[PDB]
Design a binder for this molecule. Sequence first.
Ligand SMILES: Nc1ncnc2c1ncn2[C@@H]1O[C@H](COP(=O)(O)OP(=O)(O)NP(=O)(O)O)[C@@H](O)[C@H]1O
Ligand SMILES: Nc1ncnc2c1ncn2[C@@H]1O[C@H](COP(=O)(O)OP(=O)(O)NP(=O)(O)O)[C@@H](O)[C@H]1O
Ligand SMILES: [Mg+2]
Ligand SMILES: [Mg+2]
Lengths: 172, 804, 225, 225
Amino acid sequence: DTLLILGDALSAGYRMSASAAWPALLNDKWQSKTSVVNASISGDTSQQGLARLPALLKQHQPRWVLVELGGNDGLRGFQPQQTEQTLRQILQDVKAANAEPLLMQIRLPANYGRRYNEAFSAIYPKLAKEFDVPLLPFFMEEVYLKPQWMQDDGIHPNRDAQPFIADWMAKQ
Amino acid sequence: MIARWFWREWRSPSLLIVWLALSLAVACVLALGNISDRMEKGLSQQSREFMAGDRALRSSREVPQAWLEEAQKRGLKVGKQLTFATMTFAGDTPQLANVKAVDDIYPMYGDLQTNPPGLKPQAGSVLLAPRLMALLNLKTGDTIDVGDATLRIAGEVIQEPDSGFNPFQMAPRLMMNLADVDKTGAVQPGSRVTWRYKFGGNENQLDGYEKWLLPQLKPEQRWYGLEQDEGALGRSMERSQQFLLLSALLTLLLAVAAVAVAMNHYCRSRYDLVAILKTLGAGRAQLRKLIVGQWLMVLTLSAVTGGAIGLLFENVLMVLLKPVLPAALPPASLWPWLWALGTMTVISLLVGLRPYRLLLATQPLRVLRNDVVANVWPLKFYLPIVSVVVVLLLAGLMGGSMLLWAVLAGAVVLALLCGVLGWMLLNVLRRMTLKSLPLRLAVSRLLRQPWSTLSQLSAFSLSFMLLALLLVLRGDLLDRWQQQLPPESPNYFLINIATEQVAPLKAFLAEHQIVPESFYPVVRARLTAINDKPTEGNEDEALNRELNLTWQNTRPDHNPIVAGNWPPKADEVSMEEGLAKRLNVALGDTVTFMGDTQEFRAKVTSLRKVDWESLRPNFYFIFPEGALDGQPQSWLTSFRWENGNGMLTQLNRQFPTISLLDIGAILKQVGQVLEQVSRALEVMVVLVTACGMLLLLAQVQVGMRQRHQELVVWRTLGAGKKLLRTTLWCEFAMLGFVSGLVAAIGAETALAVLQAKVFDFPWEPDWRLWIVLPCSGALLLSLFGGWLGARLVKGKALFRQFAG
Amino acid sequence: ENIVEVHHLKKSVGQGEHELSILTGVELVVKRGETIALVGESGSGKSTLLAILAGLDDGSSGEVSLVGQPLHNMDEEARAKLRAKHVGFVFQSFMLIPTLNALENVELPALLRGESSAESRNGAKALLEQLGLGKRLDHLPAQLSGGEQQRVALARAFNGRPDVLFADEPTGNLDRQTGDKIADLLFSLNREHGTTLIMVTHDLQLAARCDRCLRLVNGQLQEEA
Amino acid sequence: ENIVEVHHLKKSVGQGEHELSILTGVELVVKRGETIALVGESGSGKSTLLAILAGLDDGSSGEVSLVGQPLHNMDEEARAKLRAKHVGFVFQSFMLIPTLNALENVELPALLRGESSAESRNGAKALLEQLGLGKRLDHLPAQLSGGEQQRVALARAFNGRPDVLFADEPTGNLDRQTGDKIADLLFSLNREHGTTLIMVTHDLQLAARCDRCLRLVNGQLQEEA
Ligand SMILES: Nc1ncnc2c1ncn2[C@@H]1O[C@H](COP(=O)(O)OP(=O)(O)NP(=O)(O)O)[C@@H](O)[C@H]1O
Ligand SMILES: Nc1ncnc2c1ncn2[C@@H]1O[C@H](COP(=O)(O)OP(=O)(O)NP(=O)(O)O)[C@@H](O)[C@H]1O
Ligand SMILES: [Mg+2]
Ligand SMILES: [Mg+2]
């Protein structure tokens, strides 16, 4: 069994080595039974994620796929319909190729705007219900009240939060 | 009694020329120092205005108010700014906006320009970027819901002075009053809200509050100023400061040399007076008081005249250059006054000390008949002591900067080369036969007194090499800045461009009469292993964060290959020299990259120079076409366009996934800074060149004064004026040729050292200097000597003036 | 025939109260080959009169003709050329170069005349050795006595080889033997080369040896011997 | 009684080949009130011998005693004090100040002696007018003739009012009348104030007028008259 991770620097690792990223830590924790491979790349869009999708699907071919994308798209700001359609197509492609998608419930920070945050957060339960996949909660809130787990920018967690993120994902 | 003495001596030609040279040196040094200090103060003030403050404190959360209360008690002015991002809605259309909130204190420094100008952040109204306004198709007087609160739109913002020079701020600018933030309710825990704190006031209270806060600093807090910044503009400011300090050092050294020559001439002239006063058995205290009183009166008069002339010259220059100058500079300090006065006094005293004690010990007759003087304090020991003293004094004055070390190394290598070449020239000339008259006359004049020839050669050589160093440094800096900022630089950037979307994008550009530049592909990969050794654990940024690899086809224009061959072949990469050095990577090393879970190895086959100050896209690695075709590729491009904004909105609607970036304000500001500093440097180099020309004229006139007796004897015998002019031309041309020849190598050495350890630029030898400097210096000296001899030959009954 | 002609030459130095009248009109007729001696007291104007006679200065008024050329009508360049061509002068303080040795000092006029170094040096050495200065070739004027400097100046004048020679105090700082030798050399040169000689000295015997003797009294020349 | 004593005084100038031997041992005994004349040829060493006799220079070897004080054993300061106290000197080139007038030049020693300006100026004016220099008070040495400069130097020496006076060529640049006047003044000063006089000149009559006459031959003194 192998778990593929496809997302942003939250899993790719912002300004840290590949082993420093949390998915590598989770793979180390799960060496015996189920390996973990990270394919996340920072700054990707939904269209860019779709472009990178076939290569990863053919190279890895895992049992489960962790799909956490659109968070940076929401941060930069996409109209809900376009990003919803692109994510729908990506999920359809992932489920088509004998791969179980894992969608992460992403909620934009409360200062980003309540209306858009609610509209963007309501997408994930709808997609999870439509595709019948678990929806792990937005654990960056667990980092919201942890300045020691964050960096100067406040966007990416520090290396200290990486073990915590790996532990939380292992629990999930 | 002695008043009539001094009044009559002031009319004497030798004392007159010595005093004129001293006063000119003092005035020029004082004026140059004052101008440089005022320019530096203006640069600091404009840098603060660009930063909109004197001290910056950036925090991710709320700092305790007690520190700000302490700052208020200290009297320093403190301002708070809150920056974040929100998703506003033009009706149904959502759009990200970078929201900023300031108090009434802002703008603390500089000026904020809005559309219409004069608007200020106030309650009940907000401001949007013109790009944002066009994207949301709103206008002045509209009401928009920012965050969770709806407010009226006051207008657009032309430019904000404190906008960071970051070419990654994709979010368009939004502005609102600091009091209305709680209306939106965006202030919540876990929010990426940045608190900037601007501090302004006198530097004494600034330092006091800084040292008060130093024990209280926290990791979440970043406290700094402007010089500590690693930005390219800050480094350029540092280079400008070093350039001004170098100019001050050069003019100080030129003044030192001129006053040293003048003091030597004066002390040699005073020999007869010393001998006659000692003959009558005058009291040692009495004669000492007389000689030191005359010397100090001369020094004081020269200092007063130099100060007055320098003040008047500075006022005239400020009046004349005011339209060229940006604004009225703040007044400077009195440190240049002390610098000039101490330099003059110390140099004169150290030059004149040895002859005074030597004549005190020596009998008057041995001075009169030039017999063997007392073997006390030989020059073989006197010169090293003087060199050590002046080196220590300069180090104390300028804090022992490495540029001073480079200058002194150049000076000593110039001195040794001058000595060796002078000995060789003396031998060859003694082995040489001639046929023309003025050539033989100049040869004889040089041969008879070799030590004065050596002294004049050294002075002219040092002056020429200092001037050449200044000119070369100014030219190199201007050329580098011009290369770094092309006037045709694009003012807009498109990022996150898809490979399938470039063709519609290319058609869009072609329809819009836009000629795009190279579309840079981007692949995100990390250098995991170097020479089969993993790079994990290394603290180098390139080995920790992501790398943006790319491939091209045409040879880079701004990155000439220093080592290696273009283009790299299959499994070959053109690497940057700095990265190769910092990663201990040499040519042929195996570099292993991981990107999109795909691992590929390349061989370093080309070393290239990359300047991060350049606004063009720059990369740590370059691949050939076909190396990373299978890797996923994003695309980046830039274009220049200022005609309207509707096409931008149309492009955004057609390509919402493509990020748009505006750099117009940053480009305008950096251009303004560069042109201001360029004007400053041009004025500085012009004035330094003028002062150097004046000092060279003074030295040539001193030499003519020293040769006056033989010239007037020749004219009395019946020498033609044309013959005398030709002889002076030949002699001074040969002197200037040799001086420029040695100064070429001296300037090469000094430039190499300073460029290696001060300006951090690659050194290159220039044969153009080696050719121009000797002939140019020879021509200048020949013209000066010819004009001076033409002036001197005028008059009647000049033989009566042989004694003087 | 008349090489030197003077008409109503006057000279005045100073201004206002400081003004002093030196000459009261000079009339002088001198042909080639004559030996002219000038006598008087110190401060009487003999030196300045001789100097303006040589054409190096212009008096208050008058006409001066040297070798049949109006010196006042000529410029400084023409006068310099005439001096380099046919005129030699000997001062009182010897006006010597402090930075040059005796041999170079006497060789200098020949070099200025474009002559080669070898012949000029040989002639200078001959002139110095005939004056007994062969052991002071490398010595400097500051290293030498006043009589040695006077002999160096005389040797330089001889090296000039002029057709007219003006000298002031030629044997003032010399003993009887050296003065006699210098006078014999000067008379031999005048008799051989026909060079006109105008000497100003206080030696009564040497003045009497000259063909004509003029005393300078109250700015006027009077024939005496 | 003997004010000047010389024992085996020798002087040599130069080095190696340039070395020249001037003196071969000098023995001299001079008491107060004597008039000593020195004779010889130019370059014989009279000037340097007189100068080292005045104690301004040190010879190769020998013992020199002035007014019963070993000058060689003293330092430059003691010699300067002795010169300011009892010694006056007159050079050949008059060593005059170019930036000062005659009156100030002669008044300078009295000022250096601490005397007030009025008395010093009156004495200087008297010395100049008795020499016939009353009309050249404001004139400069460059503005004056060589004889005028010599008279200025003599007047300065007189203003020094020393007990011993060394002079070189006192009447070389003077006519017969001025030389006679200077000699009469010097003899009157010697007879009145008892000031010892040591004069070096080429005038045979003036040398014979002195009490003793010494000729300098091959670096040795020989009694002549
Ligand atoms: N520059 C001057 N300023 C004032 N007076 C001057 C100047 N030059 C010359 N005189 C006067 O003119 C006089 C004549 O000078 P000079 O021609 O040297 O006299 P002389 O009788 O030839 N002397 P000498 O050759 O020594 O016997 C001087 O002594 C002064 O009185
Ligand atoms: N500094 C010196 N270097 C070399 N030789 C010197 C030096 N000083 C003196 N002499 C020699 O010593 C000689 C004597 O000098 P000096 O004492 O002036 O001679 P003098 O016979 O007294 N001359 P005068 O008084 O003019 O008749 C000189 O002429 C030189 O030959
Ligand atoms: Mg005269
Ligand atoms: Mg002598």
